[PDB]
Ligand binder design. Sequence first.
Ligand SMILES: C[C@H](Nc1nc(N)nc(N)c1C#N)c1nc2cccc(Cl)c2c(=O)n1-c1ccccc1
Length: 815
Amino acid sequence: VKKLINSQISLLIGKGLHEFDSLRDPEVNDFRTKMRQFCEEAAAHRQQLGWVEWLQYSFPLQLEPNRALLVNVKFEGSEESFTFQVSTKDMPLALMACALRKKATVFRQQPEEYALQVNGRHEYLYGNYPLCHFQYICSCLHSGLTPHLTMVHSSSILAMRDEQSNLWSLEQPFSIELIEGRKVNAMKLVVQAGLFHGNEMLCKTVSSSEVNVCSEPVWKQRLEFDISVCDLPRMARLCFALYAVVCPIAWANLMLFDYKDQLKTGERCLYMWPSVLLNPAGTVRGNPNTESAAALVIYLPEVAPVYFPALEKILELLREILEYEHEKDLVWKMRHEVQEHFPEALARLLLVTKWNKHEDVAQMLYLLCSWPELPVLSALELLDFSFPDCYVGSFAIKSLRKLTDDELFQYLLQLVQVLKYESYLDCELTKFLLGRALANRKIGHFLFWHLRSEMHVPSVALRFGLIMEAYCRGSTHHMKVLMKQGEALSKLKALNDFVKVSSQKTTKPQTKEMMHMCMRQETYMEALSHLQSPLDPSTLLEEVCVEQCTFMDSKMKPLWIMYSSEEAGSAGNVGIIFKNGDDLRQDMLTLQMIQLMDVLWKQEGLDLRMTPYGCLPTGDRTGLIEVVLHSDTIANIQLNKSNMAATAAFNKDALLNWLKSKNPGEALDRAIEEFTLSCAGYCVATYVLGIGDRHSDNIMIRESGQLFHIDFGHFLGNRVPFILTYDFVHVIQQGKTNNSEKFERFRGYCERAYTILRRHGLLFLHLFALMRAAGLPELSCSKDIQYLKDSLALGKTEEEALKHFRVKFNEALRE
Ligand SMILES: C[C@H](Nc1nc(N)nc(N)c1C#N)c1nc2cccc(Cl)c2c(=O)n1-c1ccccc1
């Protein structure tokens, strides 16, 4: 009944829905109700879209950031096919007309009733775009594959849609009573408190008295703060730190206002979190491990039933050479000049605002309500924790609504991590993510995985769980599609555990042949087959190809899973790598950033022929990596095996020999330039991102000639110099030991790549600052965000970074 769905949702999201109920938290219950209605209502909107609108929902166009080609076309009811010559400049429509006409005149005697499906993928060609704007077509013009498409009539598209349906009156100091605490180790105990707005201190911190390493220590000590109850900003949070003195122990935070803006009065038991001293960015909800978490007991002094003032009441209440406090005062003084003449400097203005004074806040808020929308780039900055105010938060979201689905997809990883900054469950960001998610199935797909992958983390398990639940209410059908993916990943985990055990006790070929027998069990064949890929919902993983499955004899023994589809031919032979035991968030970020470089470069004419292959954490130290087909490690090739076509007289010739064995005759020259472009992209990418520990085992090359990096795990230093491998130069110089014309064009590719990136440098800084929310160990400080200082030399001009890049480039040809 409705129980079945609840059951399925509990299984999918990784948490029983009953566990939400058992909290009897009215904030939790209001979220679920309000968001369910919101999400069910979008679902209602979806069920009645035009068939082309539904195409846009479920299969958003995959577009690239004249000269004719072969295309293969068939219809849905018949396996009869027609091969056409068309131009890369032709619209899908023209192709559909040539398809309809040749059908008409073979069955004996309208294109607007059709769309073109890519064979074996959840991808479609439609809209008024030349064919060469479609990613699948571009991937065929480079692979030399022939595009195979299927004429799908509007009637069976609608069949798909339908089957997928379902008070400033308070003078006194604000003060706390610190009653007592309880859990321990090991000396003397102190409780440091603190009033914060974001990570701006609302006032001076106050420590408690030194008390003995008693367990259940006691204080009753009233703590009064240097700020009045009427001057607490809406988003004020009180932060505690409990430590030992002759060593940190725990921290815990909370909002002084509830989620209904009612200022908090009464007793609070604060279930604390373990430590590294005050941690304002930390979550405002208590440690769920109540059986063993230290708890701090406090009392919140009553003051009368007061609510934070409504917005109406709030509202009724040389400058250039900046783009020091005397400086800070000029900006606030000249704040009207900001709005009307420097609207995008809003961030800087908000940072000089006095958040501990309600009149200053009301003034700023009044300006904020008249403030014109900002560019996406400005808005990305405003989402950071250093802009905690809810109205600012909303303004930021409002400025983000013009995000295209392509950009939103690029930034989605960061928007999700920002959720960990929120103070309340119901928030504009959550509502925005959900809306976008319900309107674009690809967003929804990855929204889900970003949330599901962290459910093992107790500080976000609740929020993320609720969000996935609401989204499931918004698509009962996608939930089942998603369950299917989790069932496959559950089986891959079981299978991987067996391989870990078996390979320690027998040989690889024995483990492999029993990996195969495990896979051939019916529950495994069923679970592992006919699923959308979590790496890319548009990629369909049909028949699992057991005989080509294997595993790496390395480390975590990751699995190699191959698929084939008898309806895709070309685009159906694909593989995924399942890895359990490594943290993959790092790799995902890095590949995201490289993909964004690829976009920035490409949307300026420069195609460095990158390979941004998929990488998706799906669970605790668990995820998928997309297999890049027809590729090999530098290591395997430089191994210079006997017998092979690439066997060389000199080690430096192995790579170039390998390429020529893969690209005979004329074909070699394109492989060389591909190697060359891709080389320059990754050299610049790895230099800017600070990816070290680069070697022949983590660099690969495609038979096309394309070089790409894998297994990143580091970046930002956690300081790296530009890398130039002599064996690469040798390929670049087409083998000749002097070839300045080929070598200097390569030096050209690097510098332009570098300068393009240097222009959108702020974008990178904004995204990485947001990423700090993720708690990756390699991105924890200002010093990390600093490293992106030099790489991009954003302090300098023109380029007066001019010549940073010489030295690093000219140093790099040490090797
Ligand atoms: C290193 C390589 N990594 C990738 N290989 C491609 N093709 N695409 C990727 N995205 C990545 C990654 N990451 C790789 N990864 C594996 C992962 C799991 C299981 C196996 Cl059995 C392998 C494996 O054999 N190789 C390998 C392949 C060609 C030569 C030497 C070793």
